[PDB]
TrEMBL record:
Residues the record lists as binding UDP: 268, 326-327, 329, 344, 348-349, 352
GO molecular function terms attached to this record: nucleotide binding; quercetin 3-O-glucosyltransferase activity; quercetin 7-O-glucosyltransferase activity
Disulfide bridge partners, by residue number: 249-327
Keyword Glycosyltransferase attributed: yes
A Pfam family that the UniProt record links to this protein: Glyco_transf_N
Endpoints of the signal sequence: none
Annotated protein name in UniProt: Glycosyltransferase
EC id: 2.4.1.-
Organism: Ziziphus jujuba var. spinosa
Domain Glycosyltransferase N-terminal: 4-47
Annotated family: Belongs to the UDP-glycosyltransferase family.
Sorted UniProt keywords: Glycosyltransferase, Nucleotide-binding, Transferase
């Protein structure tokens, strides 16, 4: 009977994790409304079989969709600029939320709690107006949440224009160099606007009684407890891992020996340099390893030149190498043929790798990738560092890539990284299981929503 209204920023990287929160919340006997703009919601309509607000059953509960217009044309280039679209969403969101809460109370299914996104903190402003509690979903590590929080509150000195190389020492965190904090917070970063977009939620954080993070207690225990006095953070992850599809990727991996395929993926946004693609190709070619390389075409908005492989690379590479543009990463990471994972250290790939027990080769670029790569190599003990990010502006040569591919496949260090990754796999799976640390936190979340209604 409890109805929760989830609002999400219109981006793929934001919609999919919030969808996982909807599935985990609905399974507990809850009615979950997933809300975003129409231009992003239509992707969810044709992905499944929903064209209206028909109740889709998810376990003991249901999931329905509700989309509001943003007054932009179908493929408006205006949406690509956050300086306009972030206030535009606030304009169109603040006039849609109150009229649908009053109608839901009229129809007998009133909203008990709000769950929003840091990119749309106006939901917390609206939740306070209607007297409905609000919570914020955070799809980054709590260690990164601590970084943004202490940057906004100036707890310690951070890299500034005058002092850009200073270290940052935060409680319950390792010592972070200037390029190890989230790159959007560096004064020489070209994506400061993304940092300002995340920091907008910290002007509003008091209006959310708790923050839901896509992590588990065993991974960041010291960090979650350290943020308690500043913000009640509840671990509900890994959200992708079901508590209780296929492609030609899995069919190809079925033919390879266990722990012998290198998985390469750089996410959905990051596009590395052509010269670095050349060095990675020669690295895989001369090392003699088997690999599955995801070469995702970039969005046409950027004037990116398409990545070209070396002359005759895919010919010298035999049946032991597979180029694709997309693969079910969760199913590939769980395949026994995968040895390591060359990743850009996106938080979703970071959590997916740890939950799957796959050691990684850290090649971060920007954002929280440089902070995730630090914990993967120096804290979680499952990674092999390749670079320090886009600000390093260094092409990693073939021989260094070659030495790291062999370091993560054969030798004594490979067995140590695999044993640490296996131990993190048992912790992640236990957390989302019945009675685990994350599943219990989800139960405690539904409890406080029931307690706050009266
Ligand atoms: O071929 C691919 C590439 C990526 N992903 C998924 O895309 C997400 C990437 O998000 P992440 O936070 O790691 O990096 P981002 O792309 O957001 O920078 C993860 O859930 C991956 O499982 C996937 O399923 N197949």
């Amino acid at each position: 009977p409890i109805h929760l209204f989830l609002v999400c920023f219109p981006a793929q990287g934001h919609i999919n994790p919030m969808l996982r929160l909807a599935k985990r919340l609905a399974a507990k006997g809850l009615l979950i409304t997933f809300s975003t703009t129409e231009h992003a919601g239509k992707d969810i309509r044709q992905a499944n079989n929903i064209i209206d607000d028909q109740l889709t059953p998810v376990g003991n509960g249901f999931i329905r969709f509700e989309f509001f217009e943003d007054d932009c044309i179908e493929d408006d280039p205006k949406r690509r600029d956050l300086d306009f679209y972030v206030p535009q969403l606030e304009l169109k969101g603040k006039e849609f939320l109150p009229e649908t809460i009053k109608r839901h109370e009229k129809e007998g299914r009133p909203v008990f709690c709000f769950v929003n996104n840091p990119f749309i903190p106006w939901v917390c402003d609206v939740a306070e107006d209607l007297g409905i509690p609000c919570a914020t979903l955070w799809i980054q590590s709590c260690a990164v949440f601590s970084c943004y929080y202490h940057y906004f509150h100036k707890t310690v000195p951070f890299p500034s224009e005058l002092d850009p190389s200073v270290d940052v020492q935060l409680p319950n965190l390792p010592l972070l160099e200037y390029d190890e904090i989230p790159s959007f917070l560096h004064p020489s970063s070209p994506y400061k606007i993304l940092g300002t977009a995340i920091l907008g939620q910290f002007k509003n954080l008091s209006k959310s009684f708790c923050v839901l993070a896509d992590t588990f207690d065993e991974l960041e225990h010291e960090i979650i407890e350290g943020m308690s006095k500043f913000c009640k953070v509840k671990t509900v992850g890994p959200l992708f891992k079901n508590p209780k599809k296929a492609d030609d990727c899995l069919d190809w991996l079925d033919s390879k020996s266990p722990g012998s395929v290198v998985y390469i993926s750089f996410g959905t946004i990051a596009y590395i340099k052509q010269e670095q693609v050349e060095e990675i190709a020669y690295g895989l070619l001369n090392s003699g390893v088997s690999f599955l390389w995801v070469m995702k075409p970039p969005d046409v908005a950027f004037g990116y030149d398409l990545h070209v492989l070396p002359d005759g690379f895919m010919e010298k590479i035999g049946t032991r190498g597979k180029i694709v543009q997309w693969c079910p990463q969760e199913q590939v990471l769980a395949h026994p043929s995968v040895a390591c994972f060359l990743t850009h250290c996106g938080w979703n790939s970071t959590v997916e790798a740890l939950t799957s027990g796959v050691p990684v080769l850290a090649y971060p670029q920007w954002g929280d990738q440089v902070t995730n790569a630090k914990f993967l190599v120096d804290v979680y003990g499952v990674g092999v560092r390749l670079c320090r990010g886009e600000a390093e502006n260094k092409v990693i040569p073939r021989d260094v890539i070659g030495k790291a591919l062999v370091e993560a496949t054969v030798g004594k260090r490979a067995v140590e990284l695999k044993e640490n990754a296996t131990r993190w796999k048992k912790a992640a799976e236990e957390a989302v299981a019945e009675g685990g640390s994350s599943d219990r936190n989800i139960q405690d979340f539904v409890e406080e929503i029931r307690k706050r209604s009266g």
